[PDB]
Amino acid sequence: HKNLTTNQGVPVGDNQNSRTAGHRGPSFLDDYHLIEKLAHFDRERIPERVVHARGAGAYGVFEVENSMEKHTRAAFLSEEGKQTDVFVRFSTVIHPKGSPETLRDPRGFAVKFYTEEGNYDLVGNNLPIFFIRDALKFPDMVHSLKPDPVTNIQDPDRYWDFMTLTPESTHMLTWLFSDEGIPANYAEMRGSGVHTFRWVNKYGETKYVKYHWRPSEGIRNLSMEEAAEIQANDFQHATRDLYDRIEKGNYPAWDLYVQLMPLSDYDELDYDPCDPTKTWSEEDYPLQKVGRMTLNRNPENFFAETEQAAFTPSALVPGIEASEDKLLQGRLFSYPDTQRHRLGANYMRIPVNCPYAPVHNNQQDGFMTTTRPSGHINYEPNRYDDQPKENPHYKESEPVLHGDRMVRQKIEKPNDFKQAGEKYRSYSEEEKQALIKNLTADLKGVNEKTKLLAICNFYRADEDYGQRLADSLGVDIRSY
Amino acid sequence: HKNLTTNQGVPVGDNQNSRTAGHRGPSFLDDYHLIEKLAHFDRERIPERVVHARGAGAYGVFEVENSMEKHTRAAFLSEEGKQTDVFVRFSTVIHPKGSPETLRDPRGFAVKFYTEEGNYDLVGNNLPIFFIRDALKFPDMVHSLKPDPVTNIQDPDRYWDFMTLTPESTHMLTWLFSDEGIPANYAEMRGSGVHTFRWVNKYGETKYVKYHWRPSEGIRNLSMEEAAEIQANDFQHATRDLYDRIEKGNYPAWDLYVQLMPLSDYDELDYDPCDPTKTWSEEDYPLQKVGRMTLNRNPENFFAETEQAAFTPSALVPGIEASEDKLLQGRLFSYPDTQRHRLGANYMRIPVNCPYAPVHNNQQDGFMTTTRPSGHINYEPNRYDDQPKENPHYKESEPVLHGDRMVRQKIEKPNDFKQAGEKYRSYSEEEKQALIKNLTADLKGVNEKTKLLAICNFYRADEDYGQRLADSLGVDIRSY
Amino acid sequence: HKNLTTNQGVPVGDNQNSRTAGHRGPSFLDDYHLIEKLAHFDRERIPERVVHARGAGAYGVFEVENSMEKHTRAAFLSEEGKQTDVFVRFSTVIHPKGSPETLRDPRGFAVKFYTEEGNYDLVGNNLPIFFIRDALKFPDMVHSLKPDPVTNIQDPDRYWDFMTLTPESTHMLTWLFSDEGIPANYAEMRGSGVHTFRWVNKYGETKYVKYHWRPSEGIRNLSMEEAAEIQANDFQHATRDLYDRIEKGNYPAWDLYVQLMPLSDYDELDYDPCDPTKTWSEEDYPLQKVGRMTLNRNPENFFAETEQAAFTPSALVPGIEASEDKLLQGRLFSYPDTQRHRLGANYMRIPVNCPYAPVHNNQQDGFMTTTRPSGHINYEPNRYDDQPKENPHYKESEPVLHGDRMVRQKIEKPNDFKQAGEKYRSYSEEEKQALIKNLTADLKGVNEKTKLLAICNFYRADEDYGQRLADSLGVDIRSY
Amino acid sequence: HKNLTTNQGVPVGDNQNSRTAGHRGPSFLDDYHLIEKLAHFDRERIPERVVHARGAGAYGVFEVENSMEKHTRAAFLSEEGKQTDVFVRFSTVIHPKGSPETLRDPRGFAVKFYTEEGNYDLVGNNLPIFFIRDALKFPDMVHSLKPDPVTNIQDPDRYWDFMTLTPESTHMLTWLFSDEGIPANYAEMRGSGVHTFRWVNKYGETKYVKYHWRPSEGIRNLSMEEAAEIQANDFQHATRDLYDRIEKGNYPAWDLYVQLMPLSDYDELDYDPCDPTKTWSEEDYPLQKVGRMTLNRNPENFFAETEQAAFTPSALVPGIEASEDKLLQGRLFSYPDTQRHRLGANYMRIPVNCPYAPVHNNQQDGFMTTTRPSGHINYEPNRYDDQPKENPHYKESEPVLHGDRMVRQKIEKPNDFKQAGEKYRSYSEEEKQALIKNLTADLKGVNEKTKLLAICNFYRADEDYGQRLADSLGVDIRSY
Numbered sequence A, B, C, D: 001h002k003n004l005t006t007n008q009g010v011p012v013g014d015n016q017n018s019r020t021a022g023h024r025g026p027s028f029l030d031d032y033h034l035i036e037k038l039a040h041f042d043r044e045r046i047p048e049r050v051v052h053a054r055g056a057g058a059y060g061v062f063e064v065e066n067s068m069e070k071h072t073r074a075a076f077l078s079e080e081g082k083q084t085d086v087f088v089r090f091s092t093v094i095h096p097k098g099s100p101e102t103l104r105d106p107r108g109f110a111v112k113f114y115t116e117e118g119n120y121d122l123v124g125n126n127l128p129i130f131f132i133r134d135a136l137k138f139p140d141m142v143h144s145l146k147p148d149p150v151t152n153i154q155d156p157d158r159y160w161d162f163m164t165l166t167p168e169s170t171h172m173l174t175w176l177f178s179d180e181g182i183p184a185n186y187a188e189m190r191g192s193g194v195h196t197f198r199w200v201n202k203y204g205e206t207k208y209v210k211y212h213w214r215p216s217e218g219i220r221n222l223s224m225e226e227a228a229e230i231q232a233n234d235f236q237h238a239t240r241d242l243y244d245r246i247e248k249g250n251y252p253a254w255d256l257y258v259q260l261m262p263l264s265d266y267d268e269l270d271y272d273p274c275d276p277t278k279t280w281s282e283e284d285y286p287l288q289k290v291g292r293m294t295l296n297r298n299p300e301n302f303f304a305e306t307e308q309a310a311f312t313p314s315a316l317v318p319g320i321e322a323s324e325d326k327l328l329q330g331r332l333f334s335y336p337d338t339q340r341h342r343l344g345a346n347y348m349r350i351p352v353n354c355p356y357a358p359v360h361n362n363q364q365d366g367f368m369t370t371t372r373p374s375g376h377i378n379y380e381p382n383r384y385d386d387q388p389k390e391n392p393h394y395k396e397s398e399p400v401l402h403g404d405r406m407v408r409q410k411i412e413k414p415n416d417f418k419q420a421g422e423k424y425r426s427y428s429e430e431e432k433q434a435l436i437k438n439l440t441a442d443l444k445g446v447n448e449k450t451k452l453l454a455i456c457n458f459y460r461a462d463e464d465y466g467q468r469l470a471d472s473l474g475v476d477i478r479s480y
C-alpha cells in the first residue's frame, strides 16, 4: 500500500474533489494538487518526429557469428559469440502518430547497439535504396509526400510531380510500388543500411560496406486489398504484432549480412557505389554473414523509451565511418539537430539514449540538467592530469579527396534508369502485375502531363514496364 | 516568376546540390542554404493537443435571428441580423493526430466568435453531457481511455475499470455507446455547450443557459460495421468531407438554440442543474432559437490556422459567464495553460487566435515577440491619461456563494443513474439493440469483476437495460 | 586518467582540430564531435528568473529547539532536536543575472525544508512587508521597478509614479529607504515570511502565524557611500561572501521565531492581519523561538543546483496552510507556473527540487522524462489495492468564508499610513537622517507632481517625516 | 482614452483587485484576467546570449564613398552615395545580461546591413584578432573565462591555465591587457571584422579582405582605476552613453576601411593570412576607404529589437564569402544554431531580423507561425512556372582546395609569438607600462607553474616584454 502524493511528496487527502466554496460553489485558486496535476497533464506531449512519427520499439541482443576484424576494428564485431545489447525502433514514414500501419511507405528499421566503445546507430529502412541522392532535396521530397498543407490529405498529384521531375527516384518507386511497399508487419520484413559506409581495420585499410538484415520470419507483404481488410479493424496491427510476439516468447530475429567492396571498384562500375539510389550486385559482391539480432524484451514505458528514442547515422564507432554519399552526409547533421528540438539539449541523458560506455567531457548545463555535475574544470587543455584527455588511439581515418574545388554539382554516372529496369525484369509475372496495378491506382488521378512523364521514366527503365503502365492507365504514347 | 531565397533574402543559386569536395566528395559545413533549410525542416513540428489531437477547421459566419438582449448583454447577440465571423474546429478525442475518424469517441465542436467586445469561445462536443463532474478527475479519465502506456494500444479493460468506479459516467456511456458514438462526418452531427453557463443582462439579472447546435444536414451515425467499412479505405474521411463540402459550395450550417433556467429552480429539481452529467428537460426548458452558423471557407494553411488554433472556455465576453460547474471551472485554467506550452507564451498573437476587437495592455516580451511594441509605460496605475485604463462598465457579475467553508466535497444530489435510464427508455428498439451490441463488443474481454459492475450500473439505470446487457454478455445476475 | 568522450561514449581522438580539407582548408560537415560540442554549448542557457534573477545558494540544517505541536501538526516542527535538511537561495530582486549585489532592493530569503511529509518552501524576503497587497498588481509593480523597456535603465520617475499612486506602498518604502535597503551581505541580514500563514494543530484548531529569521551574525547595512565603494571593486560581493564563509567553516546561522495570533483578533484590530503591507506588534504578539538554521555546505554545481532551484509558497505541508492574503494567493499560482516555463514540465525531478519523502502519482511524460517509469496503471480510481491511493488523514482544514459573493474589492481597513508613521517614529535620529537622505537622492529628479504626491503620502504617515523630506527636497508644502 | 483589455480583446473592469470570496477571502480560479496577466508575466524571459549577453543596440545608415565593384559584386557597395540601413549591437563578452560595462573584455561590434540582395551581417569585435584559431576550442576557451561553475565568480587561474596552454592566444592577450581591454564606451571604440573573408567580383576574381571600422569620435580607453571609478556609480554606462548620444542628436559614426590581399600571397608570408590570431601589415596592405556608418536612431523596445536581434557570420551576400579560417568556419554553424534555441525556429521573422529583400521559399511551420502562409506547393522541383525557382546568376564561387585528405591537423606556420612581439614594440612606453601593470594584477594570484608559462610565452614574443613582466611579478627567470 502506497499514498498518492503531490510532486512535493505531500500525501494527497482527496484525489476526487476540487476545493470549492461549499459543496457546489466555484473553485478556489489555492488547490495546489489540482493545479499541479492539471498543469503536468497539460504538458505531457512533445513534438512527434518530423518523419517516421508512427512506430514501435523493442530491446534485444546482437550476437556475432563471424568476427569482422579483418575488415573493421569495430569492437562489437571483434569476436565470435560477442553479444551486444540493442534497442530497435520500427516505423512507417509519412503520416503522423496514430496513423495506420497498413499504408504504403518504406518502413524504418533503426538499431542502436550499446557497444563498449560507444553507442552505434544503424538507422535503416526495409527497402535498400532511396528516392533521392542529396540531402538538400529531403524537405522538398517530404513536403511533396506529406499531406497537402491546405487539405491535410496526402495527394499523389503532389509527390508524383516531385518524383517525376526527380528521375533518380525511379529505382525506388519500382520497389515501393511492389507489394513490398506494404510489409505484413515489422517482423516479416527486410532491413537495409541503404547507404554505403566505410569500414576501417586496425591497419588503416578501408573497404566500402553495405548492411542487410534478413528476417528469420521471412519477408511477407500485403496487397492493396489485404491491407484494406486489415485497416478496417486495426490501425495499429504492426505495433500489436511486435509486442504480442515478444510477450509470448516468439522472439523475432534478423541475420545481419554485409557486402564488401574495394574503394578502387568505383572507377570501373557504371554507377557511383555511394549513390543511395543504387544497390550492389549480390553475384559480384556476395552477402557475408556477420551475426544475428534477436528482439526479446518489450519496453516498460512507450513514451519514455520508444517515443523519446533518438537514433542518428552520425553515431558511428571506431572502425565504422561515413561514406561520401551526399544523402548520408546531410543525415549526419539532421538527426541530432532535430533531436535537440524534439527532446531537449540533454536528450542523450534520457535512459534509452544513454551509452553503456563511460561519458566524460566538458559540456555543461542546458534545460533539465539532472546528472548531479561537480568539479571546477570544464575546459581543456588544462593543467590537471586526472581530467579527461583526448586519446589519439581513437582518431578516425583520413579519406582521400578526389575533388579540387568546393562545388555544387551532381555526381558523375547518375545512371537513373538502369537498375530500375533490372529490378522490374527480376520480378515474377505475378509481381509485375501487382506493380502495374499499384502504380495505376496511384497515378490514375494525377495531372496528365505528370502522368505522362511518370510513364516515360518507367519506359526508360524498361520498355515493357512503361508500355504496360501506359496501357493500364489508358495513355497513348505513340507521339513519343 | 520569383526567386527561391534563403530566409536572409539571398537568392538561391542551386536548390539541387549540396556543397561538396568535388562532384562526389563529402559535404562542407559552409553551406548556409543546406543547413538553414534542414534546420527549419528539423523544427516544423510542435506538440499535438493533449486531447482532440485529430481535427479539421473552417471559417464562417454566425447570424442572429432572435436578439437575446432580454437575457444577456452579449454584444454579438444584441440585434436581429447581426453577423459575427467564426472559426470552428471539429475533432475526435483520444487518439493522436493521424488517427482514423471512424473510431468511437465524442466529437469536438469548438466555435470561436470574433465579437466586437472580444473573442468568445464556445468549446463544445457533439454529445450534451460528460463522463465526470470535477476536473480533478480529468487526467485520470483521459489516461484510462488513452492507449495503454506500455503497449500503445487502447484497452477497454482500463477505461471500464475507471468508468465503473466512477458511476456518474453512466449517463454519458449510454449516449456514447449508441451509434451516435460514431458520427458519419462532422456536418451531420449535433453540437452542445455541455455546461450550464450564466447569462447576465444589462440589469444584472442572471439566468442559467445551455447551448445546442442543430445541423441543417441532419444527424447521421455509423454502426460499427459501417465504420469499419469506411475505415478500410479512408482514415480521414470526416476531414475530407468537410473540406469537400465547402470547396463545392455546399456549406454546412447549424442553428443555435438555448435553454434558459432560473437560478431559483435549483430546489425544484432532483439533480444539480450545473452537474455536466445532466441534461435539462426540453419540455420544462424549451429550446429557443437564437441564430444560424454557416461554414463557408476553408483555411489557407492547415498548420498555421487549424493546428495552431487555441480555444478556451474562459474566453468569455460581457454578458456570458461561467457557472459553478466544477468540471467547467478546471477547464477555465487548463486550456490557456496547455496553449502556452503547445504554442508559446505569445499564442494569442497567432492570426487565427487574434481578436477583431482592439488589444491594449501592459503585458510584454516572451518568446517570439513579433508585434513591434513601443512606449515607456508598461505599468498601471500611471500618471498618463492616454494610457489604457480599466473600464468599470465591463465588470462581471458577483455570483452568490451558498457555501460557508472551503471544502472538498461531492455535490449534493449526484443522482448518477436516473437520466441514463430515461435516455435508455427514449431509444427506439433498433437504437437499444445497437447500444447493447456496441456495449457487448466493448465489455466482452474485460475483467469479470469490472464487467459485472458495469452491468450493475446499467441495471441501476434501467432494469431492462442491465438485464439485456447481462444476457448478451452471458453473465448471470440472478443473486443480485 | 580518463578519456574525453562524445555524448555517445566514443573516445575523442582530437579535441583541438576541426576536420578540414587538408591542414588549412574549409571544414567538413562530418565532424560529429565539433557539431555535438558546439550544439550543446549553443544551448547552455535557460531563462533567468523573472525576478530575483541574481542570487546564491547553500545547503544546511534546521534544528527544532521548541516543539510547535500545540500550534501546528507540521512534522518537521514536532519534536525538540528534530533536524531537517534545507536548501536556501538568497537574492536581489530587480536586475538581471550578472547585476551588482550593492543595489538597493529587498533581498530574497528562500528556504526549502526537505521534510518527512514533503518539501516545505518558505519563500521569504529580508524585509517583513511588501509594497502591494494584491497579486493582480505584481506585474505592474515589477514593470515600474524594472529597467525602462526602451532604455534598459532603471528610472525612479517610473517606479515612483506607480508607488505614489499605490499608497499602500508607503510602509514598505519607509523600510526600503532606510539603510536596510542595502544589506552588507546575505549573512548579516534579517529574514521574514512576510505573509500571515495558518497553522493547524492535531485538534484542527487554527492560529495565524508570522515567521522571522534572526541572523547569528547580526544585521549590518550599507550606506549609499559604502555601497558605491564596494560596487567599484566587486559586483558580486554577497555571492562571494556566502561561499567564502562556508568554505572556511564560518557557517552563518539564523534563529527562527514566530508570532501567533488568534483568528478572532481580526475584528478588533485597526488593520487586516492578512494585509502584507502590515506587521504585527511584537509587544502584543511576542516572538516565540522555534529553532536554528545553520548553512554549512556549498553546492557542487551552481547551474544545476542554485540556478535550477525552484521554490513556491504553495509548497505547504500538513499543518501549515495559506492565509487569505490576496498577495499570497497569486503567488501560489505564479511560482510553479513560471517554473514549468523556466525549467521544464519535469522540474520537480531536478535533484535540488526533489523531495526526500516518497513521490507516487499518476502524472506522466513531458519533456525530458528521465525517471524510468513502468506499469500499466496511470489512473485512479482503479481496481488495484497496491496502486497509490488518497489518504484522508492528510486532508487540509476548511477555512470559514465570511464573504457572501464573488467580488473584486479592496480589503476593509486598508489603513495605508499608520504603520509607516509608527516605523518612522521607531527610528533613531541617525536612522531618520539616513531615510530622508536616501529618499531625497531617489526623488530629487522625479516629475514634480509625483514628487509632491510622495511627500504627501509620507506626510500622512507622519508630519515630521513628510516635512523633513519636503525640506530636504526644497519643496514648500505650507500651502497644503 | 483607451480600454485596458485582456489578450482576447475584452475590456478589463478592474485592474486592481483579484476575484475573491468577499472583500477579504481567498481567491477564485475563475479570474481569467489575473491568470492571463500573471501567466504572461511568468513567461517574459528568454535565454540570454551564451556570450555577449550584455549589450546595446541602435539603427543607422551606411553610405558608400568609394564603390567596390572592381573587387566585389556586393550590391550595397556598388555605387558612390548608395545608402543601406543598418542595425548594430555592441556588447561585452563574458558576464551575464546585467553585468557592468566597466569590465575587461573584447567588445562586440555586430552590424546588420539590410541590402537589396539580402541581409549581410558583419559580426565583429573592437579588437582585430582572436585568442584561438579553431572553433573546436571555443567552448573550452569560454568555459575557462566564464565564472567558475562552482563559485559563480570569474577566476584568472582558470582562464590563464587555458590561455597559457593555448600559446596562439599570446597576440590577443597583448592587445586585451592594454587599456583597450576597457573601452571608454561603445562610441569611442575600434571595430574589426577579425577574419579574413573572400571578395568575389562579377568576373569571378577573388581577393582576401579584412574590414576595419574607425570611430569618428576617436578611440578612448579606461585604466583599471578609471573603470572602477565609473563602476562605483553606474554599471550600464556604455548602454547609457550610446542612447544619450543618439537622443541628443550627437550621432556616433565609423568609417569603413578594407585591406585587400591576393590569394597567391600565401607563400610570401611567414604566417597564414587566414589565421585569425594574425593581422595584416597596413604598410604592405594599405587601408582603403569604403564609406561611413552613422547611428542615428534608438530602438522603440529593447527586448523586441535589441534582445531578440540575431546576427550570423554566415549571413553573407553575393560577392562576399567565407574564407577557410577554421574559427570562422565553426561560427557559420553556431550562430543560427544557438538562435533557433534562444529565439525559436522562426526567429528570422522577428522584425529586426527580417530582410528588406523579398523572402520566398518552401520552408514551413515551426513554433509561432505568424506569417499567414498560403498555397499548395511547398516543394521544388515542381511543374509550376510561377513558384519560386533557383537563380543560377547567384551561385557562389568555387574555392580551390589545396588539401587531398580529410584531416584534423593544425595549420602550418602557426607562428604564435612574432606578431605579439611586434605589437608590444609598437606600444609607447606609457602603453607598455599599462600593459605590464594590467597583466601583473591579473597574474599575481595564479598557480606558479601557470604564471611562469605565461611569462615564457610573453618572453618568446619579446624578451623585454617577458623580462618586465617577470620583474613586476617577482619571478626569477635566469635559470631559463
Ligand code: HEM
Binding pocket: C048, C049, C050, C051, C052, C055, C089, C090, C091, C107, C108, C109, C110, C123, C124, C125, C130, C134, C135, C136, C138, C192, C193, C194, C195, C309, C310, C311, C327, C328, C330, C331, C334, C335, C338, C339, C342, D042
Ligand atoms: C503577488 C506577488 C508576487 C509574485 C506574483 C511573485 C512572483 C515571483 C516569480 C514569478 C519569481 C521567479 C520564480 C522562479 O523563476 O523560480 C519570484 C521569485 C522570488 N520571489 Fe516573488 N513574487 C511575489 C511576491 C513576493 C514576496 C511577497 C516575496 C517574499 C515575501 C517574494 C520573494 C521571492 C524570492 C525570494 C524569489 C527568489 C526565489 C529563488 O531564489 O529562486 N516574492 N517571485
Ligand code: HEM
Binding pocket: C042, D048, D049, D050, D051, D052, D055, D089, D090, D091, D107, D108, D109, D110, D123, D124, D125, D130, D134, D135, D136, D138, D192, D193, D194, D195, D309, D310, D311, D327, D328, D330, D331, D334, D335, D338, D339, D342
Ligand atoms: C569559434 C569561434 C566563435 C564561436 C563558436 C562563437 C560563438 C558565439 C555564439 C554562440 C554567440 C551567441 C549568439 C546568439 O545567441 O545570438 C556569439 C555571440 C557573439 N560573438 Fe562569437 N563566437 C566565436 C568567435 C567570435 C569572433 C571571432 C567574434 C568577432 C570577430 C565574435 C563576436 C561575437 C559577437 C559580437 C557576439 C554578439 C553578437 C550580438 O550582439 O548579438 N565571436 N558568439
Ligand SMILES: Oc1cccc(O)c1O
Binding pocket: A051, A052, A093, A106, A107, A108, A125, A142
Ligand atoms: O526519412 C524518410 C523520409 C522520406 C521517405 C523515407 O523512406 C524515409 O525514410
Ligand SMILES: Oc1cccc(O)c1O
Binding pocket: B051, B052, B093, B106, B125, B142
Ligand atoms: O476533452 C475531452 C477528454 C475526454 C473525453 C472527451 O469527450 C473530451 O471532450
Ligand SMILES: Oc1cccc(O)c1O
Binding pocket: C051, C052, C093, C106, C107, C108, C125, C142
Ligand atoms: O518578488 C518581488 C518583486 C518585487 C519586489 C520584491 O521585493 C520581490 O520580492
Ligand SMILES: Oc1cccc(O)c1O
Binding pocket: D051, D052, D093, D106, D107, D108, D125, D142
Ligand atoms: O564570442 C566571444 C567569446 C570570447 C571572447 C570574445 O572576444 C568573443 O567575442
Ligand SMILES: [Cl-]
Binding pocket: A361, A362, A363, C037
Ligand atoms: Cl567537451
Ligand SMILES: [Cl-]
Binding pocket: B361, B362, B363, D037
Ligand atoms: Cl496588463
Ligand SMILES: [Cl-]
Binding pocket: A037, C361, C362, C363
Ligand atoms: Cl495524480
Ligand SMILES: [Cl-]
Binding pocket: B037, D361, D362, D363
Ligand atoms: Cl526551401
Ligand code: NA
Binding pocket: A066, A067, A068, A080
Ligand atoms: Na573470426
Ligand code: NA
Binding pocket: D066, D067, D080
Ligand atoms: Na566608383
